[PDB]
Design a protein around this motif. Structure first.
Motif, PDB file in Angstrom:
ATOM      1  N   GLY A 119       0.848  -1.174   0.000  1.00 23.08           N
ATOM      2  CA  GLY A 119       0.000   0.000   0.000  1.00 23.08           C
ATOM      3  C   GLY A 119       0.880   1.219   0.000  1.00 23.08           C
ATOM      4  N   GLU A 120       0.485   2.257  -0.744  1.00 25.40           N
ATOM      5  CA  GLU A 120       1.263   3.485  -0.806  1.00 25.40           C
ATOM      6  C   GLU A 120       0.381   4.688  -1.114  1.00 25.40           C
ATOM      7  N   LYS A 162       2.619   3.571   7.888  1.00 26.68           N
ATOM      8  CA  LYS A 162       2.250   2.172   7.696  1.00 26.68           C
ATOM      9  C   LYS A 162       2.134   1.803   6.230  1.00 26.68           C
ATOM     10  N   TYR A 163       1.937   2.789   5.358  1.00 27.45           N
ATOM     11  CA  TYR A 163       1.905   2.557   3.921  1.00 27.45           C
ATOM     12  C   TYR A 163       3.360   2.499   3.484  1.00 27.45           C
ATOM     13  N   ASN A 216       4.661  -0.284  -2.421  1.00 29.07           N
ATOM     14  CA  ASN A 216       4.217  -1.394  -3.237  1.00 29.07           C
ATOM     15  C   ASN A 216       5.405  -2.019  -3.954  1.00 29.07           C
ATOM     16  N   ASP A 264      -2.373  -5.215   6.537  1.00 26.37           N
ATOM     17  CA  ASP A 264      -3.390  -4.501   5.767  1.00 26.37           C
ATOM     18  C   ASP A 264      -2.768  -3.470   4.829  1.00 26.37           C
ATOM     19  N   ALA A 265      -1.900  -2.606   5.372  1.00 24.08           N
ATOM     20  CA  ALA A 265      -1.276  -1.522   4.624  1.00 24.08           C
ATOM     21  C   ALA A 265      -0.145  -1.984   3.719  1.00 24.08           C
ATOM     22  N   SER A 266       0.467  -3.140   4.007  1.00 25.52           N
ATOM     23  CA  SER A 266       1.532  -3.641   3.155  1.00 25.52           C
ATOM     24  C   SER A 266       1.017  -4.321   1.907  1.00 25.52           C
ATOM     25  N   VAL A 310      -4.808   6.263  -1.817  1.00 20.15           N
ATOM     26  CA  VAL A 310      -4.037   5.099  -1.387  1.00 20.15           C
ATOM     27  C   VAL A 310      -4.144   4.011  -2.444  1.00 20.15           C
ATOM     28  N   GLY A 342      -3.108  -1.636  -0.096  1.00 18.13           N
ATOM     29  CA  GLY A 342      -3.568  -1.552   1.272  1.00 18.13           C
ATOM     30  C   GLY A 342      -5.054  -1.790   1.415  1.00 18.13           C
ATOM     31  N   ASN A 392      -9.211 -10.047   3.496  1.00 20.71           N
ATOM     32  CA  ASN A 392      -7.856 -10.236   4.015  1.00 20.71           C
ATOM     33  C   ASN A 392      -7.557 -11.712   4.218  1.00 20.71           C
TER      34      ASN A 392
END
Ligand SMILES: [Zn+2]
Length: 461
Positions: free
Chosen positions: A1-2, A61-62, A65, A238-240, A283, A286, A298
């Motif tokens: 996520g980014e 946390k982002y 990618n 989640d964010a990765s 975003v 993520g 998830n």
RNA sequence: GGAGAUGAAAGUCUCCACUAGAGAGUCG
RNA sequence: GACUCUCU
């Protein structure tokens, strides 16, 4: 996520979304009776406890990618899982707007003591103004669906909860991504039947622990996961999640027979926009915490991940011999031959995933005597050894009891903690109960009797 | 409990994180 | 069947 970009709400037309900046948490009558190290999370930019800038820590946390497109391993992994799901015969047809809003046997109704999201939470409109449990009215909903459209932005709030000392100094509070009721309704209409199936089948065909009751599920796990166990933790699952895994999820959704119209909705969650206070942000990647389906998805994505990690890391992996259970990011899995996770973590980084060992150690063996899942361990009963106790560690139960968001419910809080604590034995439970009694409020509480907890547990079987 | 609005006050009204799962309690 | 709590 980014995060792709940040623009002021003046530029994007988005209304301001502000959340609460002071904790509902205050020390309890048992605060200085038990030990613990946690405190309410940082909710405000100028918290004294801070040692870094708040927001920069909030959104770190982002991590970014890596892959955007599935390789050959992620394809085979999607396909293996996708095929495993076919025996469930998921209803891929669209569920009705009445059922999506108000519930079924295997899907609770939309929560109505909770915010309706953008843009209602800024217009003073509550869910209760649009839905009515007793009316089962889908009239006002279908009007607002066509008023504000779909793909409304997620409302960002800092989570009010106990965090360790570090995450307070370092500013590492969690964020929730509040969905719009419009998207929750549509997401529920498009995948509600899949939800039904997943809630109705916690186990190793879904690979989903969602819907399970640890009191009885824990005794099936050692039969559902035969052979050598492996597990690990993710840092920021989640964010990765890189966009590849949403591509992978799309592969699984099609193979089980979802319409292309249905499958198109997945990009709506790989690519999301968000409002935090007075800024809009983008975003890419993520998993948004607060969307209708987060846990199941998830959990599915995790099934794709373990298969891919396995077959890109080791030679001659038979994915039919993998059994595994996911609860979003939490995993327990087994294979006939021990799986070295030092090497999975290496494959993991290639895929934007940061995996650490399960025992919070810096070396990666996992057995029942030390495996944990949903924060609890596995403890065979001293009398009937085929019955397994989930053991929530008394350390975590001490952390909870020391605080409260409303003392009017101290009695209720302590009972729930006792239903969790008793699986650690008579001797530990009475150590717990007597230290509760050691305080004037504790002597006014109704506390469950250990033998009644034990007896009730055994009648389950 | 905290915040606001209003009001001499009384009061009144408004706000105080999402998606799910599990267990419990209370009432019908 | 509502309403609430604590956990994950
Ligand atoms: Zn965007």
């Amino acid at each position: 996520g980014e995060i792709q970009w940040v623009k002021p709400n003046k530029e994007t037309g988005r209304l301001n979304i502000n959340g609460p900046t002071r904790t509902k948490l205050e020390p309890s009558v048992f605060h200085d009776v038990f030990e613990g190290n946690k405190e309410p999370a940082v909710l405000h930019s100028k918290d004294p406890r801070l040692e870094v800038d708040f927001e920069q820590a909030l959104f770190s946390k982002y991590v970014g990618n890596t892959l955007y497109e599935p390789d050959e391993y992620i394809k085979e992994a999607a396909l293996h899982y996708a095929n495993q799901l076919k025996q469930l015969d998921i209803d891929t047809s669209q569920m009705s707007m009445e059922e999506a809003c108000y519930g079924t046997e295997n899907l609770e109704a939309i929560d109505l003591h909770t915010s309706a999201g953008y843009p209602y939470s800024a217009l003073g409109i509550k869910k209760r103004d649009i839905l009515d449990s007793t009316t089962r009215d889908v009239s006002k909903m279908k009007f607002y669906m066509d008023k504000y459209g779909l793909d409304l932005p997620y409302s960002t709030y800092v989570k009010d909860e106990l965090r360790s000392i570090d995450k307070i100094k370092k500013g590492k509070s969690r964020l929730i991504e509040a969905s719009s009721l419009n998207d929750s309704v549509y997401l529920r209409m498009t995948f509600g039947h899949l939800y039904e199936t997943f809630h109705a089948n916690p186990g190793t065909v879904t690979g989903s622990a969602v819907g399970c009751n640890p009191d009885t599920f824990w005794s099936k796990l050692p039969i559902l996961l035969p052979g050598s166990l492996f597990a690990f933790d993710y840092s920021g699952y989640d964010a990765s999640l890189s966009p590849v895994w949403f591509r992978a999820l799309e592969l699984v959704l099609r193979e089980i027979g979802y319409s292309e119209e249905a499958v198109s909705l997945v990009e709506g969650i790989n690519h999301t926009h968000h409002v935090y206070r007075n800024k809009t942000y983008c975003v890419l990647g993520g998993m948004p915490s607060g969307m209708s389906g987060t846990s199941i998805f998830n959990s599915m994505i995790n099934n794709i991940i373990i298969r891919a990690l396995l077959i890109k890391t080791f030679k001659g992996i038979d994915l039919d011999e993998l059994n595994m259970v996911a609860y979003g990011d939490d995993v327990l899995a087994s294979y006939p031959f021990p799986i070295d996770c030092l090497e999975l973590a290496r494959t993991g980084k290639e895929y934007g995933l940061t995996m650490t060992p399960a025992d919070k150690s810096p070396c990666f063996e996992v057995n029942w005597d030390n495996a944990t899942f949903l924060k609890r361990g596995f403890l065979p009963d001293e009398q009937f050894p085929f019955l397994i106790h989930p053991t929530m560690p008394m350390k975590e139960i001490h952390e909870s009891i020391r605080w409260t968001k409303d003392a009017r419910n101290t009695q209720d809080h302590v009972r729930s903690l006792c239903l969790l604590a008793w699986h650690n034995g008579k001797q530990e439970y009475e150590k717990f109960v007597s230290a509760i009694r050691s305080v004037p409020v504790g002597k006014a509480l109704a506390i469950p009797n250990y033998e009644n907890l034990r007896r009730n547990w055994l009648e389950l079987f």
